Amino acid sequence: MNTVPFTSAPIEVTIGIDQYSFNVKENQPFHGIKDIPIGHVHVIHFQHADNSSMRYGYWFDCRMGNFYIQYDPKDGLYKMMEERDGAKFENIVHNFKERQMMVSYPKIDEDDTWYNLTEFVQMDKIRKIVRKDENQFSYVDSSMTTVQENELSDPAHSLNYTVINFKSREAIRPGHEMEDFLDKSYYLNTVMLQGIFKNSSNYFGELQFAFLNAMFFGNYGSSLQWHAMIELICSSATVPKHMLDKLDEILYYQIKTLPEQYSDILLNERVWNICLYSSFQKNSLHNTEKIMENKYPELL
Amino acid sequence: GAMNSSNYAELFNNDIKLFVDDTNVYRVTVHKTFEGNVATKAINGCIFTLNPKTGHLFLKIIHTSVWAGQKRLSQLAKWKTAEEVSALVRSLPKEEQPKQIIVTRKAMLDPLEVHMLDFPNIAIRPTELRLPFSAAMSIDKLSDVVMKATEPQMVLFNIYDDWLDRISSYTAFSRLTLLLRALKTNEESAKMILLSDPTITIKSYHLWPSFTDEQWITIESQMRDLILTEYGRKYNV
Numbered sequence: 399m400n401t402v403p404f405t406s407a408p409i410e411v412t413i414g415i416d417q418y419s420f421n422v423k424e425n426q427p428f429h430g431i432k433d434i435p436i437g438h439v440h441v442i443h444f445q446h447a448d449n450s451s452m453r454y455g456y457w458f459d460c461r462m463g464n465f466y467i468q469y470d471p472k473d474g475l476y477k478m479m480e481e482r483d484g485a486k487f488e489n490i491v492h493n494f495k496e497r498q499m500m501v502s503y504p505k506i507d508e509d510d511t512w513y514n515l516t517e518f519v520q521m522d523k524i525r526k527i528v529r530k531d532e533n534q535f536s537y538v539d540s541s542m543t544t545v546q547e548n549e550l551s552d553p554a555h556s557l558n559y560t561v562i563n564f565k566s567r568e569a570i571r572p573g574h575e576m577e578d579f580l581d582k583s584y585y586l587n588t589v590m591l592q593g594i595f596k597n598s599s600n601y602f603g604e605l606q607f608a609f610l611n612a613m614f615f616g617n618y619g620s621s622l623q624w625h626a627m628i629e630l631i632c633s634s635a636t637v638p639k640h641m642l643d644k645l646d647e648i649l650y651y652q653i654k655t656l657p658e659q660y661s662d663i664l665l666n667e668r669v670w671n672i673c674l675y676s677s678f679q680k681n682s683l684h685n686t687e688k689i690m691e692n693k694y695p696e697l698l
Numbered sequence: 699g700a701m702n703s704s705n706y707a708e709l710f711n712n713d714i715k716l717f718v719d720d721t722n723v724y725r726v727t728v729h730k731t732f733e734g735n736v737a738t739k740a741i742n743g744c745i746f747t748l749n750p751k752t753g754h755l756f757l758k759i760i761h762t763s764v765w766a767g768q769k770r771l772s773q774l775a776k777w778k779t780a781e782e783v784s785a786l787v788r789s790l791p792k793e794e795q796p797k798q799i800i801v802t803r804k805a806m807l808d809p810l811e812v813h814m815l816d817f818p819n820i821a822i823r824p825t826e827l828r829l830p831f832s833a834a835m836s837i838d839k840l841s842d843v844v845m846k847a848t849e850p851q852m853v854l855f856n857i858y859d860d861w862l863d864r865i866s867s868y869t870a871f872s873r874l875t876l877l878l879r880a881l882k883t884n885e886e887s888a889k890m891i892l893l894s895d896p897t898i899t900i901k902s903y904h905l906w907p908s909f910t911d912e913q914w915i916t917i918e919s920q921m922r923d924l925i926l927t928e929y930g931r932k933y934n935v
């Protein structure tokens with residue numbers, strides 16, 4: 399179990415850690431988050447009390463270094479930093495734990511939610527979507543645009559998700575126009591899985607990362623990416639059976655975790671109705687169809 | 699975006715454009731089977747691809763053999779249309795290729811866009827105009843070449859005959875759309891109007907009769923009357 403200490407909390411802020419959130423008052427003696435499960439990526443995120451504009455946060459993996467948070471009064475945000483002096487860091491954490499000034503990652507033993515949402519998400523792949531090679535952790539916020547959004551403007555601050563475009567030469571083989579547009583299996587299996595992602599685990603990792611950025615930061619381009627990666631699978635007649643079964647589990651846990659009151663903005667009616675009721679895979683997502691019908695029957 | 703009454707003069711500017719109408723591509727007769735079920739029999743069809751500025755019509759005849767052994771023919775017909783329009787564009791010299799292609803039915807947008815990916819600078823546009831190009835098969839010479847075809851064939855016509863020697867392309871298109879709207883609303887009456895008088899003939903190299911300017915005014919008035927007539931007979935007004 400690892401710890402992310404905070405130097406202090408000088409401004410009032412709602413802090414998230416994965417699917418959990420707590421309120422810290424301005425200058426309230428707060429010294430970080432302990433008991434963070436090892437073995438998963440994590441995200442620590444922020445919304446200031448005085449400007450709910452800009453949710454922002456950091457993806458990290460405690461196995462890759464000792465990380466802490468420190469507020470910067472010039473740039474006006476809580477920043478993640480790495481401490482290279484391991485003995486300094488352990489000494490800092492032990493003192494903060496002795497004074498009991500940290501919140502405990504509040505995981506229920508029965509509960510696999512976070513594993514289920516991050517099963518295929520790897521830090522190394524996050525760092526290729528979010529390019530800032532001098533840091534071991536990755537910053538994301540509400541406003542960052544994707545490479546594909548930038549084609550339709552600062553490249554260093556972009557989300558480099560894999561571009562998916564159903565009316566593109568990459569997606570459509572010359573001479574197979576109708577076939578490839580109506581059945582996207584060659585684009586899914588040959589172009590994307592064999593060619594770009596290499597395997598379905600990397601595809602699911604990017605899909606899951608896109609969903610989490612949409613949910614935690616309201617990042618619109620991430621929501622677009624999540625839906626495009628669902629639609630590409632659902633619109634393929636030929637999908638390995640293990641991928642369909644895994645997709646059903648992935649989406650089930652995403653829909654289960656989504657705040658009921660954000661469904662209007664985070665769920666695309668057209669994609670979901672097409673995927674569950676019209677697509678080739680309309681009968682392959684039983685768990686997802688059941689939770690959607692019981693939790694969001696309005697959208698459908 | 700979409701072509702409508704507001705941007706109507708754009709049709710007659712000097713940017714090459716084509717209308718594509720697919721309503722006569724897949725044509726069937728519905729009939730009873732010996733067991734009392736219903737079946738369809740396809741008949742030859744055509745793509746109607748028209749330059750509204752010059753009157754040049756590229757009539758691609760769709761022979762019934764293209765449907766043999768195929769499923770979902772109404773969907774296939776849109777893709778076959780888009781395949782043939784793309785092939786036509788590729789066949790034309792670069793300086794003759796269109797800048798825009800306007801489809802008369804919105805269901806042609808995605809098929810045509812996908813077939814024209816190699817031409818990113820050709821705009822594929824819908825229209826809000828309800829153009830009467832389905833009535834092309836009421837022009838006797840067009841219907842004749844389609845029905846007689848024994849294989850796929852492209853035939854080139856000028857749908858304006860020689861009108862552009864005397865009138866502008868705006869006026870020629872307005873005459874064409876009026877004639878076609880009339881043929882669509884009451885084919886029998888429209889054709890009676892066009893041929894009632896035996897002394898006005900259709901030249902061998904023309905589609906419509908050789909009316910003088912004054913006779914075209916009478917004709918056009920008779921077509922408007924017919925369209926209004928039928929509009930009453932219909933709605934009881």
Ligand SMILES: CC(C)CSCCC(=O)Nc1cccnc1
Nearest residue numbers: 420421422427428498499500501
């Ligand atoms: C009384 C003194 C010995 C500190 S004990 C309070 C532990 C704590 O810091 N909880 C907390 C909860 C939410 C946000 N920030 C902090």
